[PDB]
Amino acid sequence: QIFNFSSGPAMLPAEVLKQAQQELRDWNGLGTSVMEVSHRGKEFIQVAEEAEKDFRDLLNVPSNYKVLFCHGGGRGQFAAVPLNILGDKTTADYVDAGYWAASAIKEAKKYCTPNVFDAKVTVDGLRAVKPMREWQLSDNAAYMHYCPNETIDGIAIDETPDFGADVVVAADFSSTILSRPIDVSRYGVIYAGAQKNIGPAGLTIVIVREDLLGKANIACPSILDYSILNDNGSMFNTPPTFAWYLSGLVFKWLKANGGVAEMDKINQQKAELLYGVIDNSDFYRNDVAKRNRSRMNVPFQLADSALDKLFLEESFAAGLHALKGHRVVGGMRASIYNAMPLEGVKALTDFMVEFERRHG
Amino acid sequence: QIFNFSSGPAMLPAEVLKQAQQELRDWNGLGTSVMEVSHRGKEFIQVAEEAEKDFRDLLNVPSNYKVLFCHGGGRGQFAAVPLNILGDKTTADYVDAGYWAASAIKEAKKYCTPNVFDAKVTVDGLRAVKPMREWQLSDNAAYMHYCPNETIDGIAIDETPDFGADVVVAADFSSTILSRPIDVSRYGVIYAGAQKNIGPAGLTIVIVREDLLGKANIACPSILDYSILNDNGSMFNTPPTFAWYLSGLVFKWLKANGGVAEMDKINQQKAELLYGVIDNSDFYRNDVAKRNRSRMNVPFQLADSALDKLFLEESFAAGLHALKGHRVVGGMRASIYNAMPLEGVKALTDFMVEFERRHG
Numbered sequence: 001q002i003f004n005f006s007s008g009p010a011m012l013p014a015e016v017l018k019q020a021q022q023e024l025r026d027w028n029g030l031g032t033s034v035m036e037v038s039h040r041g042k043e044f045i046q047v048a049e050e051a052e053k054d055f056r057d058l059l060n061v062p063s064n065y066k067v068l069f070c071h072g073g074g075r076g077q078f079a080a081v082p083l084n085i086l087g088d089k090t091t092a093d094y095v096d097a098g099y100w101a102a103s104a105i106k107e108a109k110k111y112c113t114p115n116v117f118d119a120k121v122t123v124d125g126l127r128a129v130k131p132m133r134e135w136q137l138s139d140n141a142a143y144m145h146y147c148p149n150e151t152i153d154g155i156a157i158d159e160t161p162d163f164g165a166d167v168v169v170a171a172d173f174s175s176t177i178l179s180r181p182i183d184v185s186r187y188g189v190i191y192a193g194a195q196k197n198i199g200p201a202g203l204t205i206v207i208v209r210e211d212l213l214g215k216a217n218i219a220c221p222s223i224l225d226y227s228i229l230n231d232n233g234s235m236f237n238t239p240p241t242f243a244w245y246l247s248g249l250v251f252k253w254l255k256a257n258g259g260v261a262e263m264d265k266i267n268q269q270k271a272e273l274l275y276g277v278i279d280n281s282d283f284y285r286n287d288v289a290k291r292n293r294s295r296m297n298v299p300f301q302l303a304d305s306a307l308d309k310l311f312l313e314e315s316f317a318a319g320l321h322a323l324k325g326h327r328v329v330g331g332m333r334a335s336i337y338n339a340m341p342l343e344g345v346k347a348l349t350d351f352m353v354e355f356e357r358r359h360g
Numbered sequence: 361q362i363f364n365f366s367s368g369p370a371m372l373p374a375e376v377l378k379q380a381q382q383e384l385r386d387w388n389g390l391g392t393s394v395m396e397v398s399h400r401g402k403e404f405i406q407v408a409e410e411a412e413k414d415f416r417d418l419l420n421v422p423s424n425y426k427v428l429f430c431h432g433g434g435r436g437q438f439a440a441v442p443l444n445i446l447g448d449k450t451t452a453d454y455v456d457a458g459y460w461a462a463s464a465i466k467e468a469k470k471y472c473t474p475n476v477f478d479a480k481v482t483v484d485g486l487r488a489v490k491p492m493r494e495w496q497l498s499d500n501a502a503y504m505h506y507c508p509n510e511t512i513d514g515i516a517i518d519e520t521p522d523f524g525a526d527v528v529v530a531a532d533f534s535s536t537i538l539s540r541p542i543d544v545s546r547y548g549v550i551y552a553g554a555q556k557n558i559g560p561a562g563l564t565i566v567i568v569r570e571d572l573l574g575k576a577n578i579a580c581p582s583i584l585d586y587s588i589l590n591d592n593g594s595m596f597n598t599p600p601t602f603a604w605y606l607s608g609l610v611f612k613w614l615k616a617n618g619g620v621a622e623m624d625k626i627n628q629q630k631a632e633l634l635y636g637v638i639d640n641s642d643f644y645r646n647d648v649a650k651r652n653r654s655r656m657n658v659p660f661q662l663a664d665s666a667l668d669k670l671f672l673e674e675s676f677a678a679g680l681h682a683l684k685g686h687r688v689v690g691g692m693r694a695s696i697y698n699a700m701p702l703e704g705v706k707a708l709t710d711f712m713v714e715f716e717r718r719h720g
């Protein structure tokens with residue numbers, strides 16, 4: 001078997017893919033593909049609603065939150081948030097503690113003067129993040145934005161926000177959503193591209209608190225306008241029908257396997273197994289504090305970088321794909337999302353030990 | 361067999377879909393799906409480049425035009441064009457002659473004060489469009505916008521633009537591109553959502569003349585910024601990888617079948633067959649002038665609208681799906697894109713005659 005450690009687009013559940021394949025040309029006895037069906041037809045509309053319903057059950061999303069499905073991916077959202085919830089304030093709080101947290105800030109500059117807070121710190125030579133109670137927010141700010149899971153850095157902030165009514169929290173859960181249960185009520189906006197932990201590329205999920213709607217800037221393209229999307233049930237224009245369909249299958253696969261509570265347990269074992277191998281070895285090394293170690297994305301450097309190529313050739317031949325670290329960082333990176341079975345994180349750890357043994 | 365006359369998402373070539381199905385879980389002997397592979401990997405990048413190359417060969421797109429692949433669909437473009445090529449001007453020419461031509465104007469209002477030209481005219485009781493030589497353009501206008509093929513109205517403007525080298529033409533080819541050969545050099549911008557005549561929903565193709573780049577409004581979200589997309593090879597952020605892949609298969613299917621010249625030849629005999637049945641019958645009727653009849657979308661009303669329901673039940677049982685007209689116009693509508701074979705069109709005309717001979 002092959003185990004894909006790509007970070008996005010990512011590996012999808014084998015069952016989900018085995019089904020999509022089978023009914024690719026004859027979905028629902030219709031004799032056509034879901035891709036060929038009109039988005040307005042009752043057949044698809046049922047898929048779309050069921051999709052949202054399952055999603056709400058999974059995260060316990062309360063009635064006062066709208067769940068939208070749009071184009072653009074995560075970066076489209078770096079623009080959408082400012083365009084939608086900035087209202088008429090001229091600033092917003094942005095917490096930088098990683099590559100993605102920073103990218104969001106760069107886009108935000110187009111629409112306002114963002115107050116940046118550098119939450120990055122180094123403790124015991126290990127990369128960590130300042131606790132929320134130490135974050136500097138401003139008074140005038142329309143909202144505060146931050147990223148709970150840096151895909152490149154392997155940094156995670158699991159702390160639950162506790163700023164109080166006055167503050168609106170916007171977060172980028174692209175690479176962590178559905179990995180652990182979260183209290184949605186603490187947030188104002190939660191967005192996430194599907195290509196990492198949900199489904200395929202092309203679709204993006206957004207969770208907005210209803211009272212935040214109706215403030216959109218006139219300049220906001222209608223396809224990004226939260227109010228427009230909500231009023232049309234995420235069907236203002238033709239949506240990524242196939243992507244929405246697969247997401248639906250994934251959501252079902254999740255409920256079928258115990259929901260996010262069970263996923264959280266499994267994700268915990270997978271992370272511990274891997275991080276256990278890295279810490280106990282001299283050959284491999286991760287430089288992130290225990291308190292901030294992501295369970296989704298795990299970057300690691302080799303003691304001898306001259307072996308990087310050989311590690312990649314041998315890991316690939318062993319059926320372990322996409323282990324190369326991000327471009328701007330080098331090293332290695334194993335992304336172990338919900339779809340990645342513990343059995344797979346084991347195959348990787350088995351290989352890593354065997355490599356260290358005969359090359360280390 | 362089943363013949364899907366949906367107007368978007370539309371029917372895809374049977375070969376293209378068979379293939380996509382076969383290698384759904386093991387694409388390129390990789391043992392993974394194209395959906396699970398990263399867009400930064402060499403495997404996909406080769407698909408993406410090959411995709412663009414085939415597309416350029418098909419339409420003979422000269423070196424001074426960039427070909428972009430983005431999110432948002434056609435309605436994302438109603439915003440993108442104004443945001444990108446409006447430059448430092450405050451007004452643009454917009455030619456209304458249909459639902460889509462009008463929708464574009466509606467979005468444009470967000471970014472400027474558009475000069476609208478009503479090209480709609482009724483000749484002999486038949487709906488027609490004023491010839492381009494009679495179109496009123498303004499002096500200060502940053503560009504002129506129009507839609508050569510109204511999907512809902514069944515109106516088509518095949519006339520080749522010939523205004524001043526000073527005039528910049530932007531067009532919405534969503535439902536007609538690749539149906540007949542066109543002289544790209546006449547246009548400044550050509551955009552089109554893939555769900556109609558190319559591939560699946562989620563992807564959008566744009567053809568921009570290079571000298572038009574670098575004018576983008578600061579407010580334009582980066583994912584829509586033509587310059588940003590060009591600089592990153594349409595890979596600024598994760599793109600709709602599966603959609604891009606299918607489009608590639610379609611482009612190959614086209615070259616394999618004779619290119620746009622052969623398609624034009626077949627599309628002509630599909631249109632003539634159908635319009636021949638409608639004109640020669642008293643039961644069915646299309647009210648569009650021969651000079652403006654779309655060969656892609658063919659709307660038709662029944663003489664007795666009380667039979668609409670029965671026409672739909674019987675046509676569906678006969679394996680002819682999605683024949684219902686649009687909500688706004690009512691009636692019926694057969695969309696016969698490139699993927700729709702002549703055998704499929706004949707099957708429809710055979711049915712229409714039979715139905716008449718039994719209820720008319």
Ligand SMILES: Cc1ncc(COP(=O)(O)O)c(CN[C@@](C)(CCC(=O)O)C(=O)O)c1O
Binds near residue numbers: 368533
């Ligand atoms: C000619 C044309 N331009 C733009 C669009 C909008 O496409 P997206 O919704 O942004 O992908 C379309 C769409 N035509 C549809 C599919 C509209 C259906 C609907 O009610 O939304 C059609 O069936 O005509 C164009 O045709």
